[PDB]
């Protein structure tokens, strides 16, 4: 939609927003597993 813009990886990770990317072979993938927890411990990962 907005080819002229660019992600904000550090700001996104600090703001707990999962981001899409382009993996191998060129298919889009989901490349983050962060939840809505603000505390920086084991709880902000998705699988725990």
């Amino acid at each position: 939609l907005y080819p002229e813009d660019t992600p904000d990886e550090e700001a996104m990770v600090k703001g707990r927003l999962n981001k899409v990317s382009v993996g191998t072979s060129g298919q889009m993938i989901i490349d983050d597993a962060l939840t809505c927890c603000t505390q920086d411990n084991y709880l902000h990962f998705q699988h725990v």
Binding site: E10, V13, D32
Partner: protein, 48 residues
């Protein structure tokens, strides 16, 4: 773009390789077995 390789990888998902260390293999090239002679003089031809 793609195929690019980063080096820092700070607090964000991704892969990165550090620049080659090559610090424990530091040699020194002086070529001690070489001798040259320098002198002044008066000659017939040459730039003074």
């Amino acid at each position: 773009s793609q195929y690019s390789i980063q080096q820092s990888l700070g607090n964000a998902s991704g892969v990165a390789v550090s620049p080659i260390n090559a610090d424990a293999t530091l040699s020194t090239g002086v070529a001690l077995n070489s001798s040259l002679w320098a002198g002044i003089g008066v000659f017939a031809r040459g730039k003074p």
